[model samples]
Each structure stands twice: as structure tokens, then as C-alpha cells.
Target: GSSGSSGLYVGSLHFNITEDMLRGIFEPFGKIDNIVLMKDSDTGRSKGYGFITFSDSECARRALEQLNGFELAGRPMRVGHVTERLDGGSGPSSG
Candidate 1:
């Protein structure tokens, strides 16, 4: 469960970003428990942001601090720790 700040919300995606791509960027720091890239419910396209979870809290923070401004897929990503979305959203559904 995403109970604490063990998750990072990454935004400003370049539409073409893939789950493997995001995982590649983050898993280098540590094992990621989850990776969720939002998609248009209707079209199945990227919503331009996603949430990632790291088992190690410090790895989560390090990824946030070090990769926040890092460019990937031709755009600078925004990384920040979150217990939940500012919009009051929950984690992505596996269903």
C-alpha cells in the first residue's frame, strides 16, 4: 500500500514515455515496487504523469532530488514525494 512518502509523483512526460522507460530511469537507484503512468481512460494514452514506489524511502527521496529536473523523453520531469495526489486521488488501479 502507498501508506507513506515511499512514492514519488513524476510529471511532465513526453507522451511517448513507456513503463519500461520510467522503470529504467528509477530502478537504477533501487528496486521499484510499483510504476504507474496515467493514461486517458478513453484512449489509453498517457496523461503525462505517473507514480513510482521504492521499497527504500531514501531511494525514493534520492530519486526525487536527483531526477526532479532530469530530462527524459525530451522533457524535464518533475519528481516529488507524495502520500497521495493533491487532487485527492488514490493509487492507480491494477484492474
Candidate 2:
């Protein structure tokens, strides 16, 4: 829904990463309410980053802590809560 970007920011993704791959990683924690896979408008390729919103904040916390720096398909993904982005914070937690 994008309401205040209520989601978890997953970073350092491999360009080839797919929604199924993300679901595999996140679905076990909780219900995934929505997913925003950042992609290039013209090329239609993933920008190697995206956001996933869980049904509740608890799920977001779980993903932020558990999957941060997780290795997937040779890339170590970085996970962070959406607050930093929504709050206009300068730094992004990438690990």
C-alpha cells in the first residue's frame, strides 16, 4: 500500500533475484502484505533492491534481524526496517 513506506528494506540483492526468492526468504516469518521490487522503468530489470511489507511490525522486525547479511545466490543481502527511510534519516543500515 506504500502508506509511509511501512516495510522492510532489503538491499544488496543480486539483480536476478525474483519474488519467489524473496518469498522463500520472508514468508516463513509472517504474512507478506506487499512487496515492492525496485526495477528499472525502461530495462525492466531489478535495481538490486526492494522493500517487503509484512502484515504486522513484528514480521518486519524478524526479517530485519534474522535476514540481514544473509547470503542468497552469492550475494549477501542487507535488511533494514523502513523507519529510517520514512523518517528521512541520512544513513541506511545495510547489514
Candidate 3:
């Protein structure tokens, strides 16, 4: 599990990027608690952005620092600390 702040904001993603593809890139950095690839509600198209929650804050930090601007699908992923969207959706770092 992870706290709302224990995640990373991802942007500039290619439209075709899938959750698995996204995982392949970030999973190397830490234990991924969850990965959300935002999609259109009606058209179901990729929103070119998403969020990744890590099991630990340190993991999130390392990922944020190292993965920013990391290229994927021919586009550099924009990674940042999860901000402005840390709602009650995810639980804390516990089961």
C-alpha cells in the first residue's frame, strides 16, 4: 500500500502507452503499488498522463529524481512528486 503522497506524477506519455509498458520502465526503480494510466471516459483514448504509487516514499523519491525526462515510446516521460491530487483514493503504507 501507499500514502497519497507516496506516488509520482507522469506526463507526456505516448497515446499508445499501455499500463504494462509504463510498468516496465518504472518498476525498475522500486516496488510499484499501483499504476494508473488516465484514459478518456467516452472515447477511451489515452490522456497522455497518469500516476504511479510506490510502496515507499524513498522509492517514490528515487523514481521521481531518476525517471524524469526518461524516454519512453519516443517521448521523455515527465515525472514529478504526486501533487494536487493526493485524495483519499489510496490507503497508507499498510494493508
Q: Estimate every model's Cα lDDT from 0 to 1.
A: 0.79, 0.78, 0.78
Residue 91, model 3: Cα distance from true site in angstroms:
30
Of the pair 1 and 2, which is ahead by TM-score?
1
Per-residue CA lDDT of model 2 for 1-95, tens digit only, reads 44564578887888878888888889997789877788887898777888788887766777777898888877678888877643434866785
Clashes of 3: 0
Listed per model in order, the count of residue pairs whose N, CA or C atoms clash below 3 Å is 0, 0, 0
Give candidate 2's error at residue 94 in angstroms: 34
User: On residues 1-95, what C-alpha lDDT tens digit does candidate 3 reach at each position?
Assistant: 34345868888888887889778877888999898878788988887889788887777778887888778776677887776443434767777
Clashes by residue pair, model 3: none
Candidate number of the best TM-score: 1
| Candidate number of the best lDDT | 1
- The C-alpha stretches of model 3 lying farther than 4 A from their native spots are 1-4, 84-95
How does model 3 fare in lDDT?
0.78
- TM-score for each candidate, following the candidate numbering: 0.75, 0.74, 0.74
